[PDB]
């Protein structure tokens, strides 16, 4: 499968799984979660613990705006 871009408005933010899976061995980290996750994602969830969140807590990955997203 492809690679995912969320259209923020400030900025597309590219989420590149290649990285991922290999950074974060613990695929139930995002995977096998209950239902609701598809719809509960958000700018919330996004600059919490849904991206930026894990980024902070793991120490590593983007958590500066212009890191995530770019026009
Ligand atoms: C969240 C940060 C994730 C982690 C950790 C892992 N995966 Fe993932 N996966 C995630 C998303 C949002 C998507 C769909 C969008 C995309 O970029 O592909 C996926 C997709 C997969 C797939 C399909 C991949 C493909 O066919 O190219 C597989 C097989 C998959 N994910 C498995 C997988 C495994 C085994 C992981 C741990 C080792 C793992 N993922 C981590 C989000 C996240
Ligand atoms: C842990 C549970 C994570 C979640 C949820 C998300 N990300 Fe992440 N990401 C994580 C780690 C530990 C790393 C470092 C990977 C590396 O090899 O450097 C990353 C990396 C990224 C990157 C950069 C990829 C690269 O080539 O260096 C991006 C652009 C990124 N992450 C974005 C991103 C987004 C948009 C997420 C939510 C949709 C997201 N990540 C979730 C750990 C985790
Ligand atoms: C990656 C770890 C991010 C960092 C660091 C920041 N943002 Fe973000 N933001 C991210 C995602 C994946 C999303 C989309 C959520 C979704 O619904 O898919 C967003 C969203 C925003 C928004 C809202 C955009 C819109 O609704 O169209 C804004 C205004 C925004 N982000 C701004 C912003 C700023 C100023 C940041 C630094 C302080 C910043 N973001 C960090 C991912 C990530
Ligand atoms: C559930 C995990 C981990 C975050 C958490 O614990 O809630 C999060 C991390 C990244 C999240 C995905 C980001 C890309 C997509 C954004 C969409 O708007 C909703 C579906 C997707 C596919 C999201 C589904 C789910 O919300 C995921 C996989």
Same mark, same amino acid.
């Given at each position: 499968?492809?690679?995912?871009?969320?259209?923020?408005?400030?900025?597309?933010?590219?989420?590149?799984?290649? +990285? !991922?899976? @290999?950074?974060?061995?613990? /695929?139930?980290?995002?995977?096998? =979660? %209950? &239902?609701? #996750?598809?719809?509960?994602?958000?700018?919330?969830? +996004? !600059?919490? @613990?849904?991206?930026?969140? /894990?980024?902070?807590?793991?120490? =590593? %990955? &983007?958590? #500066?705006?212009?890191?995530?997203?770019?026009?």
């Amino acid at each position: 499968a492809d690679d995912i871009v969320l259209k923020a408005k400030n900025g597309d933010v590219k989420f590149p799984h290649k +990285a !991922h899976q @290999k950074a974060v061995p613990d /695929c139930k980290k995002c995977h096998e =979660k %209950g &239902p609701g #996750k598809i719809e509960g994602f958000g700018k919330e969830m +996004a !600059h919490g @613990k849904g991206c930026k969140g /894990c980024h902070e807590e793991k120490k =590593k %990955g &983007p958590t #500066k705006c212009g890191e995530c997203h770019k026009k």
